[PDB]
Structure 1
């Protein structure tokens, strides 16, 4: 039955990954963004020029009004709507139906995207960051509460244009990754918050106080495209990546993610861009592990020539490990055990000389000092 969930995700580059769902009776089909960076389940529920379809509550015999408003602001986009409940299923997910909280979106601002093919969002993080407040049970909490689906899911995001992947609900599909799973503690159940204890670029330690890496917080967010870094860390990383690639020159707007860079088709100089290693807090005392990402992950292809946007960018709200970090890895959100596992994905990037990797164990002293308070 996990084989039924393999490849149940689709998307457009830079516009999220979505899963098919149905809401209401009779079932209404909608494509729903898979977002580990938020905790509300919300769907277009009124006309919008970028929506191909939307939730029609008046047509669902199982719809219930909660008679309460709601709004959710994201780093990109915001919407407001009306809360209610209805029956929900995932056709290429477990064979169950649950009554879930649903925000019916009536107004929105830069949220829906022209031609994205999704019409709602599935916030998979914890109640603590749900709107209007933590009494609004998130979907996955309802799923686990009302069924026997185990309290974990995994995400296999594959890159390139259209992308694809798998959300395995209730377990781990071992045919989707190679080597060992390495786990890092969920520091606190709100976002999927983790602790980064070291950063290396081409094998060179950035040598910053590890608190800077988690300044504010560090989270795993499938709803974000980029690897986002606190200002200070971003500036150090860019300086290092600039130096490694100084054999070529790029407009300063490239490094800000604003303009593309292009090379003759097939001639992209991958070798002059460095690998980045993020070391994560491990499961045992003084132990960490590292995930290594290739330039093929942080140079996102965009439309004769191969063209790319720099997909590492600046944040003032902590580190965000977005889709470019998740792609190529099998990522297990093991809620039952308060940990997130990483392994090399079966849909990994192919460089003839370097490999994306998950490696351990490493010894790292004083890892608790890396958490921001």
Structure 2
């Protein structure tokens, strides 16, 4: 399981995520598993479903053990539930180790698996604090690093219905996947991969918001999310600014809402009217930041429907959040992202698989120094529910 063994180990469908092959059980059942840095459960479909053709069959695994505890995982717009267990787990195009991990066998779901794409399960790569049913359920990556000698890091190259590829480097960094400098931003708190944005610019123009507005009520790095999602106030300022820049073209409201495509005759899309977006992340040094800059080729996603397949058509992939900024696939496809859990930090460097203009490029640039660096994190109002629960850990 070399870094060369790990290169190009991801596949997916456009806007339906990236998945990696894993083997569960003995004898080995192979499944395609979504890589999800925004949750913390390893869960696999384990019963028939109209949109699956394989699933994890507990009864075929000699190594499976039932934990005799169910789990229920609600989302804003769907759910999964299942039965907790443990089994031997391997990643065939990854490190040459095998581990006993927690696995939730998914027995019912709603709007979770969908038509087309080809994963049967999710690998929650974030921290125990957001695991279901509670943070005593050790996540896969925790188990990987506690049971083997794999270094406590992994990296993601996501290259951007169309088929997509990429790489997850487990336990290292592969220098072939990126060009130029690697910049690190602190992980603010180990739950999500929470980071702190200090400044936002649209074509070099500062949004000039209180920087806490950028991180309201959190900012996270999430391979499980398609869009760049932005807090409501922030999202409105960004759309006003992008609208201003692209004003030679007057799009319907549906477009800005992500509910409608806009099209140009093949080859003729005016990329130059759409601005770049730079998010400045807290540096490792106090008073420092660096910026990650994305092109409209990342936030305007190609979509191919029929009859007028002669046109290139696009959806706007920046959307409104009430749960904070989410740096989803729109951001991550620009970059090689290092999840350096050992050193409690996330790195960004420019990806070798750039989707880029003849005249412009996605960039990772710093330092930028500030005197009077205000504190830009937001403190989430502490609920009694959260205050009461004891953590003897």
TM-score if structure 2 supplies the norm length? 0.94
Distance 1:183 1:76 in 2: 33
Q: Residue 300 of structure 2 contacts residue 316 of structure 2 at CA under 8 Å; is this kept in 1?
A: yes
Give the secondary-structure state (helix, strand or coil) at the position aligned to 1:351.
coil
CA distance in 2: counterparts of 1:157 and 1:147, whole angstroms: 26
Aligned counterparts of 2:373 and 2:52: Cα–Cα separation in 1? 46
Contact 2:302 2:314 (C-alpha < 8 Å) held by counterparts: yes
Q: Deviation string for 1:12-49 (max 9, x for gaps)?
A: 01101000001001000100000000000000000000
Q: Is the 8 A contact 2:231 2:324 kept in 1?
A: yes
Q: Residues of 2 paired with 1:26 and 1:165: CA distance?
A: 28
Q: Is the 8 A contact 1:281 1:367 kept in 2?
A: no
The superposition leaves residues 289-310 of structure 1 with CA deviations (integer Å, 9 ceiling, x where unpaired) of: 0000000000011111111110
Displacement of 1:94 = 0.4
Q: Which consecutive residues of structure 2, in runs of 5 or more, have no partner in the other structure?
A: 305-309, 380-393
Corresponding residue pairs, total: 373
Give me the CA root mean square deviation.
1.0
In the alignment, what sits opposite 2:299?
298
Q: CA deviation at 1:240?
A: 0.3
Q: 1:61 to 1:194 in 2, by over 3 A?
A: same
Partner of 2:35: 34
Change (3 A) 1:106 1:89: same
Q: Is the 2:161–2:303 contact (alpha carbons within 8 Å) kept by the matching residues of 1? A: no
Query: Cα offset for 1:285?
Result: 1.6
Q: Distance in 1 between matches of 2:75 and 2:352?
A: 31
* Per-residue deviation, 1:331: 0.2
**Shift in CA distance, 160/365, structure 1 to aligned 2, threshold 3 Å:** farther
Counterpart CA distance in 1 for 2:293 and 2:239 is: 17
2: CA distance, partners of 1:367 / 1:113: 45
2:44–2:56: 8 Å Cα contact kept in structure 1?
A: yes
1:222 aligns with 2:228: no
Q: Distance in 2 between matches of 1:77 and 1:16?
A: 17
Report the alpha carbon displacement of residue 368 of structure 1 after superposing the two structures with TM.
Answer: 5.2
C-alpha distance in structure 2 between counterparts of 1:160 and 1:150, whole Å:
36
C-alpha deviation, 1:133, in angstroms: 0.2
Runs of 4+ in 1 over 2 A off after TM superposition: 73-77, 364-368
8 A Cα contact 2:151 2:172, kept in partner: yes
Alignment correspondent of 2:382: none
2:176 is paired with a residue whose SS is helix
Normalising by structure 1, what TM-score? Answer: 0.99
